[PDB]
Design a binder for these strands. Structure first.
Ligand SMILES: [Mg+2]
Ligand SMILES: [Mg+2]
Ligand SMILES: [Mg+2]
Ligand SMILES: [Mg+2]
Ligand SMILES: [Mg+2]
Ligand SMILES: [Mg+2]
Ligand SMILES: [Mg+2]
Ligand SMILES: [Mg+2]
Ligand SMILES: [Mg+2]
Ligand SMILES: [Mg+2]
Ligand SMILES: [Mg+2]
Ligand SMILES: [Mg+2]
Ligand SMILES: [Mg+2]
Ligand SMILES: [Mg+2]
Ligand SMILES: [Mg+2]
Ligand SMILES: [Mg+2]
Ligand SMILES: [Mg+2]
Ligand SMILES: [Mg+2]
Ligand SMILES: [Mg+2]
Ligand SMILES: [Mg+2]
Ligand SMILES: [Mg+2]
Ligand SMILES: [Mg+2]
Ligand SMILES: [Mg+2]
Ligand SMILES: [Mg+2]
Ligand SMILES: [Mg+2]
Ligand SMILES: [Mg+2]
Ligand SMILES: [Mg+2]
Ligand SMILES: [Mg+2]
Ligand SMILES: [Mg+2]
Ligand SMILES: [Mg+2]
Ligand SMILES: [Mg+2]
Ligand SMILES: [Mg+2]
Ligand SMILES: [Mg+2]
Ligand SMILES: [Mg+2]
Lengths: 92, 93
RNA sequence: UCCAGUAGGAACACUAUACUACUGGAUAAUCAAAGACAAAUCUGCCCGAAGGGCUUGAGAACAUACCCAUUGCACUCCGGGUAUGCAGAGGUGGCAGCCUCCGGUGGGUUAAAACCCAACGUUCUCAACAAUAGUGA
RNA sequence: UCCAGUAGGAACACUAUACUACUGGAUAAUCAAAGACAAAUCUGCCCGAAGGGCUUGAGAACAUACCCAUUGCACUCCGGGUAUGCAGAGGUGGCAGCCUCCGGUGGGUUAAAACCCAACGUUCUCAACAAUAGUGA
């Protein structure tokens, strides 16, 4: 079921953390407010990213019209996060 | 570059069999109009590429526009207009 | 191995020497390029018995490049591997800030420059070395 | 090396030798598994002087899988490597349909099946070989 935070993978792992951050925010901002967007290049967290919207509908609208988007020459795979983010759990 | 019945596509997943590529392409482009034929070769020079021929010029335009970048077989499509008319069309009108 | 130019020459300051680096040269060692400790000595909080490193090395981290793995649901940084790092500087120790210089970017301005604006720049731990001569207080 | 079972034994057809392959066995050579040329002798067009290959090997092409190349404007076809291919068959030459049989795959049906439907299946060139005997027509 829907969730403020969307989970993205299949991301071009060769992209620097900094760039990936701003690039993601750039293409998702048009969908609403973005509290934060977590990105790690660990062995376990690379090629992945968590985007946090302030509204649940924003995430839904983003998951739908952006699914498959050719991000850095790779089709995005957006899903809902299986659990709420800390920023949101400790907010409401 | 001006419109053309036939659209040129490249950056296609070269690992895909000729047969599959054929039907898969027709499957996603049919919604844009009639398709006379769709040429696909796996030569050294023609692989990763495909030519789709519509019966209407507008069909090709509508297809080039709303399909550009489409994640086909895990690869962004690169649709352009064919630089020259196809034989099927030249020998038709 | 020598010679010169330039920078440095490491716990106060200058000079000379040893010596290190860069550049070019062959006893006459060319001519030259090149280059940041210039100015000034800041505010706040904190620690110490005492605040001042243009040395080298060994670890560690970090950054950048490729290579091998990895399709991975997290919210504390954190797989492995080769190569690279030798530009940042002054303001007396640490953190924060502010000022100035240097640098290569990105803007603004110009005919073009200046001039301005902004962000950014390898750090920690350990170990060795920080010499000699002269002068200065 | 022998023995058996099975298939084959290559230019009409049986059969028996030689011989090839698969499977299992040791002179008594086990028991067994396994397996498609069964039915039928089709419709066009074209070629010939005469239409009938379950043989072997090599090469080439092609498919599949992997590896390096390649972002590439075509409309007969096509870069390299590397490993597999030993199942397709009958309907008298070539081509095109069609029919049936094998095979696996996909789909429908059924409680399961049987059985239906569908698309599929290694080709070409060269070289060698297509033997004895018997009975046939
Ligand atoms: Mg982050
Ligand atoms: Mg000097
Ligand atoms: Mg020294
Ligand atoms: Mg030299
Ligand atoms: Mg000085
Ligand atoms: Mg000074
Ligand atoms: Mg100093
Ligand atoms: Mg210093
Ligand atoms: Mg070091
Ligand atoms: Mg998954
Ligand atoms: Mg998990
Ligand atoms: Mg690493
Ligand atoms: Mg190193
Ligand atoms: Mg540096
Ligand atoms: Mg200091
Ligand atoms: Mg101070
Ligand atoms: Mg400071
Ligand atoms: Mg500057
Ligand atoms: Mg102007
Ligand atoms: Mg700075
Ligand atoms: Mg000294
Ligand atoms: Mg026999
Ligand atoms: Mg034989
Ligand atoms: Mg044997
Ligand atoms: Mg028969
Ligand atoms: Mg015969
Ligand atoms: Mg086969
Ligand atoms: Mg025949
Ligand atoms: Mg015939
Ligand atoms: Mg035939
Ligand atoms: Mg069948
Ligand atoms: Mg039938
Ligand atoms: Mg068949
Ligand atoms: Mg014979």
């Amino acid at each position: 079921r829907p969730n403020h935070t969307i989970y993205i993978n299949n991301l071009n792992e060769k992209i620097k953390k900094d760039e990936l951050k701003k690039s993601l925010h750039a293409i998702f901002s048009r969908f609403g407010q973005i509290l934060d967007i977590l990105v790690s290049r660990s062995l376990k967290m690379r090629g992945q990213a968590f985007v946090i919207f302030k509204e649940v509908s924003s995430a839904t609208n983003a998951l739908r019209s952006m699914q498959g988007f050719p991000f850095y020459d790779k089709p995005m795979r957006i899903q809902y996060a299986k659990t709420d983010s800390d920023i949101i759990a400790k907010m409401k």
